[PDB]
Amino acid sequence: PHRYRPGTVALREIRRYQKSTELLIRKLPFQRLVREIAQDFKTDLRFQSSAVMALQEASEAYLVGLFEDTNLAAIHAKRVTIMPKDIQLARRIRGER
Amino acid sequence: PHRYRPGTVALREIRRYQKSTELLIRKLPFQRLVREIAQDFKTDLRFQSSAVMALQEASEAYLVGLFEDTNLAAIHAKRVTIMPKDIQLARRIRGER
Amino acid sequence: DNIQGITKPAIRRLARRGGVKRISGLIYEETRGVLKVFLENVIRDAVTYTEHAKRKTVTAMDVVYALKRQGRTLYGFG
Amino acid sequence: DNIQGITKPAIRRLARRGGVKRISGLIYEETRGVLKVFLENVIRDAVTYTEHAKRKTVTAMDVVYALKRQGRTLYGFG
Amino acid sequence: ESYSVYVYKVLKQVHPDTGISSKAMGIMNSFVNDIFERIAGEASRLAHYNKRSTITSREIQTAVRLLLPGELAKHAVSEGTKAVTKYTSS
Amino acid sequence: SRKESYSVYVYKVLKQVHPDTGISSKAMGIMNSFVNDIFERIAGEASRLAHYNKRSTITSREIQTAVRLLLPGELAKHAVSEGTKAVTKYTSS
Amino acid sequence: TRSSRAGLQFPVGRVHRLLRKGNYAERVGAGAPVYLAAVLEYLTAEILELAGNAARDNKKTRIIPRHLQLAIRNDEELNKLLGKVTIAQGGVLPNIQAVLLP
Amino acid sequence: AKAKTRSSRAGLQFPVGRVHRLLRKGNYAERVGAGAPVYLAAVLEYLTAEILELAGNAARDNKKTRIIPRHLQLAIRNDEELNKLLGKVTIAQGGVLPNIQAVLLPK
DNA sequence: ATCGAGAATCCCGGTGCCGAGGCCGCTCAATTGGTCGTAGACAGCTCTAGCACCGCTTAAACGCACGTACGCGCTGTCCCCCGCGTTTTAACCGCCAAGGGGATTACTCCCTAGTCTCCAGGCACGT
DNA sequence: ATCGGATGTATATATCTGACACGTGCCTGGAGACTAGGGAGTAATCCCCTTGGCGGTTAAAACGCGGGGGACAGCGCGTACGTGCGTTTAAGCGGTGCTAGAGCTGTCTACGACCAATTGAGCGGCCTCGGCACCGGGATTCTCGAT
DNA sequence: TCAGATATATCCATCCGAT
């Protein structure tokens, strides 16, 4: 019926996702990935739950910061969409690479 | 009657400067600039020449890195000439505010 | 294989909180790679810290020590 | 107005050493501003260190410490 | 072993009708510990710098001048000097 | 008074590595400052690690842990191997 | 108690034993721990009043870490001191670039 | 009896007693062991030898006998591990490694 | 899709120069050989929270059409940065004098560590 | 500009509930006194290292003037990408049970702090010639208007 | 031990789709 013009819903969800404080990432897949990565360095380890929570918080915060930086990079080139060139630029400048 | 193309001297000076390791900045204007800045905190201060040289090296290295970043940001933007939007973006992404 | 545990909607939600309108289809793999490399970069120090103490479990203080080592201080877990 | 002692050719030489090819006219003021800010931020700490030791002459090692504050770690002197 | 009741008393001094969560308590404890660590480390490093052997008021005043930004430094050093002179007065 | 420097040792190491190569004084200052920086960084990391475990002394193993933390990747692999070889030399005495 | 002698709230004894046991220096002075107590009191007081103001701006009588994030990020001087730190469960202040809006 | 230096017992070249005195004076902990300074001296010696090898190679490459800071800068910038260890340090009088962007090259 | 005048650059060889390296004399910090208090190496006991499993439920991830807007290529305009000649001027080098303060040395004194003795307020605990 | 319907936004009402602030007990850390001696404050002296100026020199900075090519505005197209809809999946959630290992307790001995001789390696002063920068000349290779 | 999360009716600011 009423077909929404694209972009307006995309413009939405900034209000709700900037006031929310949730983790936005599933718990069990993340814990399985953490255990998979830790399997390489040393076998037969056990993980504290609080450590997993803190890891998740740090990781999501780092991704949010990187996305902010790459958005600011992408708006420069008179474009609106993100391109992996922008990610490469952002990690190139700030000294991570 | 023989005039070079407008963009060929640039590469020659890139080469000769990058194979160079001199100071590239006059000494007396920098010394008087440092004294003018330092007069605002505690008057009648007596600088040491080695400190002046250290400030020279640190500041020049910082500027060289900053223009490298600016050139990279500009060449991302399908352009050759740099404009102050590039320098402002590079300063902001590096986190200096 | 567990790197595919991060589906597209999670990435889109993170990007929306980041403040973006439109994302291309190539972003997901780059985000996955950056996430993964960050994980081993942290976990290496974490496991070293827990190994020096002659234990078998990574406490939260180890993770906090690992994060502070790289200059990314975290508050909330002591 | 001593800040205008940093001439146009000097900025050109530094830009060339950076590895840029063509520069617009308005860059000069921005460079002269950012360099001024950087010198402010260094000299403040250096003067603090020299003032603490009841001295009135600024030695180079104090500048080395001051750069060490921002994590620049100048080599050579001292 | 934490600074639990002290921040609560300070809050009662400034805001007699507001509460805090446990998570806010942890954030306060960790923040105070971090700031204390920074100040103590800078003071120790500066005390070694001058071939000195003790920690005095001058060293910490210099460290506070060095770490905090401009406007906060004046207020902090003023309140600290007020505290030390009230202490030494009696 | 007297100033202390790492000049003689590094000169001996150079003559052990490359028989016929010279050195300028500025390079010597670079080497001295580099050695001081590395020593201070390692010592600080080791001291913090010893505090993290409610210890009160400096043994070799936490130095090894600090080396494993600070040096990037494979460059540590030789260094640790260089350490254990040296220390067991001294234990034999 | 020494804390009441200077009229503060933070303890002189705890910071004193921390300074001696933390092995920063061989010997410690006398008025230095008091100075630390003063500066810590100042920092905690200002941050708590800022957080309380931000909380009552949301018709709330309790402090939550969201209020702390909003308060910390809203001051230019405080943002400079804690630029490189992530707060657990804190969220991010709202911002939208102008070009995106139609 | 005849006194033998500890650095000679281990066969090292960097002094050991100096490291021990510095660690005692450096106020890092209450007390120190005997097995630490030898390990630290070995690590320092290995690192400085590793850098000196590349420095000498770089100097030899341009038919020169001495060592100049330009050679050290090139040696550090060439090796990726040493670059990572020294990623935020400025070498005075060192210059910059040669690099020219590909797009900027004329067609 | 080539070439030659010309301009920038590599190479050989001669020249002076200054500091990198070597030699020697003189110290104090490293070395030996002892003693002595204690930190943790070691063994042993406990109780918890970390791991594993299962059944149920539902919010969410996914595959699929479908219309579209914007990313990108193209064309065209025009203005402004570069290259080159011409004309100052202030950086720079070498020289000189002068005086002030940053280290030194000696001397004395007072402030915190140490030791012991006494006493409550602040950490678990319960509602 | 303009309105209509239709989605998603704040606001009040009611209803649990689970952290929450408020008492309680007791012992481990916090004061209070006396001493010493070693580090730190103060007086006096030099010598060197910085400041300041003078005059000659020319490398580099400043000014002016075509002119080509890079920045930028407008047009057009087609495809990757938003958005709803039906459908499947596995993440949460709540129980239950088993046990490896974190964490605390009690000894004693090997180990490092510390002190009194003991001496040789490392620093400062004084040569000195050989690698290295400079310059001058010739030989070499790239460049752009010409083909 | 009650301040606050949450179910329920509603709710006002906005946007497409023509007009």
**Using only C-alpha atoms, what is the Rg of chain E?**
16
| Best A14, A27, A47, A63 residue to mutate vs chain C (most C CBs within 10 Å) | A63
B28, with CB counted inside 10 A (0-12, 13-18, 19+), is: exposed
| Best A18, A22, A78 residue to mutate vs chain G (most G CBs within 10 Å) | A18
D59: three-class secondary structure by DSSP: coil
In the numeric block, which tokens belong to residue B60? 């020049």
| Nearest CA-CA partner of C74 in E33, F66, D72 | E33
Question: Do D53 and E59 contact (CB within 8 A), yes or no?
Answer: no
Does A2 contact strand K, using a CB cutoff of 7 Å? yes
C10 CB contacts (<8 Å, ≥6 apart)?
A: A24, A25, A26
Write out the H or E segment, with its range, that includes residue D16: helix D8-18
In the numeric block, the tokens 């630490």 are attached to: H36
Residues of chain H contacting residue F71, judged by C-beta atoms under 8 Å apart: 85
In the numeric block, which tokens belong to residue H21? 């005195």
What distance in Å separates the CA atoms of residue C2 and residue C10, rounded to the nearest whole number?
15
CA angle B49/B53/B59 to nearest 5° reads 140
What distance in Å separates the CA atoms of residue C47 and residue C58, rounded to the nearest whole number?
7
What distance in Å separates the CA atoms of residue H98 and residue D16, rounded to the nearest whole number?
12
In the numeric block, which tokens belong to residue B2? 């023989």
What distance in Å separates the CA atoms of residue B48 and residue H76, rounded to the nearest whole number?
30
Question: Do G36 and E39 contact (CB within 8 A), yes or no?
Answer: yes
In the numeric block, which tokens belong to residue A11? 């413009």
In the numeric block, the tokens 């405080």 are attached to: G78
**How many angstroms separate the first and last alpha carbons of chain H?**
79
Write out the H or E segment, with its range, that includes residue A81: strand A81-82
D29: three-class secondary structure by DSSP: helix
Nearest-CB residue to G92 (from C17, C74, C75): C17
CB burial string E50-76: b at 16+ within 10 A, e below: eeeeebbbbbbbbbbbbbbeeebbeeb
What distance in Å separates the CA atoms of residue A55 and residue A35, rounded to the nearest whole number?
12
Pairing of strands G27-28, E54-55: parallel
In the numeric block, which tokens belong to residue A42? 């040393």
Packing angle, helices H17-25 and F25-52, rounded to 10 = 60
- Given its phi and psi angles, is residue D6 left (phi above 0), alpha (psi -120 to 50 degrees) or beta? beta
In the numeric block, the tokens 């505690």 are attached to: B42
In the numeric block, the tokens 């600070």 are attached to: F70
In the numeric block, which tokens belong to residue G16? 């004193």
What distance in Å separates the CA atoms of residue C62 and residue A47, rounded to the nearest whole number?
11
Contact status of D17 with chain H (Cβ, < 8 Å): yes
Chains E and A in direct contact, meaning 3 or more beta-carbon pairs closer than 8 angstroms? no
H104: three-class secondary structure by DSSP: coil
- Distance from residue A12's CA to nucleotide J20's C1', rounded to whole Å: 38
Question: Do H78 and H58 contact (CB within 8 A), yes or no?
Answer: yes
Sign of dihedral through CA atoms F75, F81, F84, F88? Answer: negative
**CA distances (Å), G78 to each of E69, E77, G4, G86, in order?**
8, 17, 29, 14
- The pair phi, psi for residue H61, each rounded to 5°, is -60, -30
Residues in chain A: 97
- The pair phi, psi for residue F32, each rounded to 5°, is -60, -45
- Total structural domains within chain H: 1
Which F positions 7-36 lie with beta carbon below 8 A of chain H?
9-10, 12-14, 16-18, 20-24, 26-27, 30-31, 34-35
Nearest-CB residue to D45 (from E49, E50, E66): E66
**Using only C-alpha atoms, what is the Rg of chain H?**
20
- Distance from residue B1's CA to nucleotide J147's C1', rounded to whole Å: 19
Question: Do E80 and E64 contact (CB within 8 A), yes or no?
Answer: yes
**How many angstroms separate the first and last alpha carbons of chain F?**
36
CB burial string G55-86: b at 16+ within 10 A, e below: beeeeeeebbbbbbbbbbeeeeebeebbeebb
- The structure's method of determination equals cryo-EM
Contact status of C55 with chain F (Cβ, < 8 Å): no
Does C57 contact strand J, using a CB cutoff of 7 Å? yes
What distance in Å separates the CA atoms of residue D58 and residue D55, rounded to the nearest whole number?
8
Question: Do H87 and A95 contact (CB within 8 A), yes or no?
Answer: yes
What distance in Å separates the CA atoms of residue B17 and residue H95, rounded to the nearest whole number?
9
Does D55 contact strand J, using a CB cutoff of 7 Å? no
Residue B43: how many other CB atoms lie within 10 Å: 7
| Nearest CA-CA partner of D8 in H37, B64, D23 | D23
| Residue H20 structural domain | 1-107
**How many angstroms separate the first and last alpha carbons of chain G?**
64
- Total structural domains within chain C: 1
Write out the H or E segment, with its range, that includes residue H54: helix H35-61
G58 CB contacts (<8 Å, ≥6 apart)?
A: G67
Residue A71's beta-bridge partner residues? none
A45: three-class secondary structure by DSSP: coil
D26: three-class secondary structure by DSSP: coil
In the numeric block, the tokens 């830790």 are attached to: A38
G89, with CB counted inside 10 A (0-12, 13-18, 19+), is: middle
In the numeric block, which tokens belong to residue A4? 């929404």
What distance in Å separates the CA atoms of residue A58 and residue C68, rounded to the nearest whole number?
11
**How many angstroms separate the first and last alpha carbons of chain D?**
33
In the numeric block, which tokens belong to residue F71? 């040096």
Chains H and D in direct contact, meaning 3 or more beta-carbon pairs closer than 8 angstroms? yes
What distance in Å separates the CA atoms of residue B48 and residue D59, rounded to the nearest whole number?
6
**CA distances (Å), B23 to each of B14, C1, D17, H67, in order?**
16, 54, 11, 20
Name the neighbours of F, counting chains with at least 3 Cβ pairs within 8 A: C, D, H
What distance in Å separates the CA atoms of residue A87 and residue C20, rounded to the nearest whole number?
14
What distance in Å separates the CA atoms of residue H29 and residue F50, rounded to the nearest whole number?
8
Packing angle, helices E4-14 and E22-49, rounded to 10 = 100
- The pair phi, psi for residue D22, each rounded to 5°, is -135, 125
In the numeric block, which tokens belong to residue B88? 């402002």
In the numeric block, which tokens belong to residue A88? 């490469």
Alpha helices in E20-68 (DSSP H): 22-49, 57-67
Question: Do C62 and C46 contact (CB within 8 A), yes or no?
Answer: yes
Question: Do G55 and G67 contact (CB within 8 A), yes or no?
Answer: yes
User: How many beta-carbon contacts under 8 Å exist across C and F?
Assistant: 12
What distance in Å separates the CA atoms of residue C75 and residue H98, rounded to the nearest whole number?
43
Residue type, B90: A
| Nearest CA-CA partner of H72 in H44, H93, H87, H88 | H93
Q: What is the DSSP letter of C23?
A: E
E33 CB contacts (<8 Å, ≥6 apart)?
A: none
What distance in Å separates the CA atoms of residue D12 and residue B83, rounded to the nearest whole number?
14
Question: Do G88 and C77 contact (CB within 8 A), yes or no?
Answer: yes
CB burial string H59-89: b at 16+ within 10 A, e below: beeeeeeebbbbbbbbbbbebeebeebbeee
Contact status of G84 with chain C (Cβ, < 8 Å): yes
HEC string of chain B equals CCCCCCCCHHHHHHHHHHCCCCCCCCHHHHHHHHHHHHCCCCCCCEECHHHHHHHHHHHHHHHHHHHHHHHHHHHHCCCCEECHHHHHHHHHHHCCC
Question: Do F43 and H28 contact (CB within 8 A), yes or no?
Answer: yes
In the numeric block, the tokens 């001048």 are attached to: E65
Residue A54: how many other CB atoms lie within 10 Å: 23
What distance in Å separates the CA atoms of residue E41 and residue G43, rounded to the nearest whole number?
18
What DSSP string describes H66-102? Answer: S--HHHHHHHHHHSHHHHHHTTT-B-TT--------S
A12 CB contacts (<8 Å, ≥6 apart)?
A: none
What DSSP string describes A21-78? Answer: ----S-SHHHHHHHHHHHHHHSSS-EE-HHHHHHHHHHHHHHHHHHHHHHHHHHHHTT
What are the structural domains of chain F?
A: 1-93 (1.10.20.10)
Residues in chain H: 107
| Residue C36 structural domain | 1-77
Q: Establish how many alpha carbons lie within 13 A of residue H40's alpha carbon, considering only the half-sphere containing its beta carbon.
A: 32
CA angle D69/D74/D76 to nearest 5° reads 145
